[PDB]
Amino acid sequence: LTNKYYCPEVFLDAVATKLAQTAVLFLNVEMLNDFYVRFPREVEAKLHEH
Amino acid sequence: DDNMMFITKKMIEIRNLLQKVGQGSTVTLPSIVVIGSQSSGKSSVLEAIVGHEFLPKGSNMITRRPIELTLVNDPEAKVDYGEFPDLGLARVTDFSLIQKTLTELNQSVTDDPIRLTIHSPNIPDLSLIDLPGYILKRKITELCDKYIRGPNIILAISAADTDLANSTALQASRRVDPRGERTIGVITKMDLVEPEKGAAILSDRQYPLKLGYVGVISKGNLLASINRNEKNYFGSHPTEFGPDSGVSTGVMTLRKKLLQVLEQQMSSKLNETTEAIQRELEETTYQFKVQYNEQPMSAESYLAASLDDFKHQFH
Amino acid sequence: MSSKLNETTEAIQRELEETTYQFKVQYNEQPMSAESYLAASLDDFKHQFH
Numbered sequence: 001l002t003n004k005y006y007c008p009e010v011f012l013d014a015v016a017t018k019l020a021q022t023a024v025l026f027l028n029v030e031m032l033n034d035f036y037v038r039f040p041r042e043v044e045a046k047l048h049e050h
Numbered sequence: 051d052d053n054m055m056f057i058t059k060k061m062i063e064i065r066n067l068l069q070k071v072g073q074g075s076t077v078t079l080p081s082i083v084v085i086g087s088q089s090s091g092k093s094s095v096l097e098a099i100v101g102h103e104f105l106p107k108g109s110n111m112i113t114r115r116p117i118e119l120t121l122v123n124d125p126e127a128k129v130d131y132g133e134f135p136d137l138g139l140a141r142v143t144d145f146s147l148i149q150k151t152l153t154e155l156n157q158s159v160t161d162d163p164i165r166l167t168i169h170s171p172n173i174p175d176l177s178l179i180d181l182p183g184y185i186l187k188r189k190i191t192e193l194c195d196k197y198i199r200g201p202n203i204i205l206a207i208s209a210a211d212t213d214l215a216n217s218t219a220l221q222a223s224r225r226v227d228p229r230g231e232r233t234i235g236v237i238t239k240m241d242l243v244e245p246e247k248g249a250a251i252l253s254d255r256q257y258p259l260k261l262g263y264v265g266v267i268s269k270g271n272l273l274a275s276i277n278r279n280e281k282n283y284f285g286s287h288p289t290e291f292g293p294d295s296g297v298s299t300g301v302m303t304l305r306k307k308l309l310q311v312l313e314q315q316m317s318s319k320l321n322e323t324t325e326a327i328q329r330e331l332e333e334t335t336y337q338f339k340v341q342y343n344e345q346p347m348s349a350e351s352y353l354a355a356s357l358d359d360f361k362h363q364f365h
Numbered sequence: 366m367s368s369k370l371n372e373t374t375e376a377i378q379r380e381l382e383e384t385t386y387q388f389k390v391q392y393n394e395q396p397m398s399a400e401s402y403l404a405a406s407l408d409d410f411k412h413q414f415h
Contacts, residue, residue: 043410
């Protein structure tokens with residue numbers, strides 16, 4: 001890991017994955033489950049109303 | 051001077067809402083409390099009637115329960131109509147029906163004060179309450195003393211025939227207000243006294259209070275009339291109590307003064323009241339945070355969630 | 366009109382007897398509201414999504 005200035009590919013890829021994963025935790029919670037709770041009520045209301 | 055009434059009306063609307071928020075809504079805004087002795091108490095009821103329009107009062111009254119009068123400026127409204135808040139959506143045209151019902155409650159006789167709402171273009175919006183006047187009797191004073199203590203604006207009335215020292219109203223207003231800073235006095239039944247006799251009473255230094263006293267004689271088209279007589283009568287002794295005389299009288303100036311005072315004192319309690327409401331909003335918001343993480347929910351979301359479940363289940 | 370009543374009436378019965386047997390061959394006369402169709406489809410979509 002210590003040759004981090006010698007392997008910018010490996011480093012930048014690791015920076016990308018971490019950001020992706022912690023970004024992914026908030027994304028799941030805040031967006032995904034919100035989607036699982038609102039989506040069926042929204043489909044029912046809007047279908048019946050349509 | 052419409053910008054001027056309007057501030058009061060929104061304030062009284064606010065008085066009614068703080069009133070109606072919930073169980074812990076200990077908090078409120080003040081309003082006029084009216085107290086008078088027996089001859090003085092008759093004078094008070096008559097005056098209050100004289101003040102906007104004729105209304106069921108007097109005859110025999112238990113006076114067991116207070117009556118909260120909340121008034122509304124009524125521009126664009128053509129019928130003298132007054133309604134009961136609990137008696138929802140019911141509007142009364144003739145005040146004789148108001149006399150039969152509110153008197154039917156007086157003989158029904160809890161200690162709950164009936165709220166009233168009356169709309170008339172002639173009346174300026176106000177917010178007075180009339181509790182039983184001093185004359186079982188211990189029970190009655192317990193209530194009066196209560197109501198008066200807290201910083202309401204207190205309206206004492208006094209019959210001219212009785213001396214000032216004698217009357218319970220003014221003396222109790224001096225029991226709960228030694229500085230007389232929050233209390234105005236009305237001298238009633240003043241048509242049967244010499245003008246010297248009016249200057250004795252309308253102006254005194256023996257028991258002086260801010261906001262002064264207001265002498266007035268109170269007793270269809272009755273409004274206009276009580277108005278035309280008040281204009282006409284000072285004419286006999288225009289000097290003794292007319293413009294620039296130190297005393298103040300007649301219904302129009304008194305109503306001006308009441309507006310002003312209500313507007314002043316309410317404006318005053320407004321900051322601390324508002325502080326209090328903010329405290330009760332902060333509490334409720336934080337509970338929303340510790341419980342349910344402040345996340346939204348409608349009953350329709352809850353039922354839809356459960357029905358999607360039950361359907362996968364049954365399949 | 367009365368004299369044409371007997372001939373017109375049978376002829377309506379004929380058209381109806383045909384329609385009824387077409388209901389019998391097609392769909393096996395099983396009853397159907399639009400709502401009963403939309404309900405079945407919606408209950409399938411809700412199991413799929415969840």
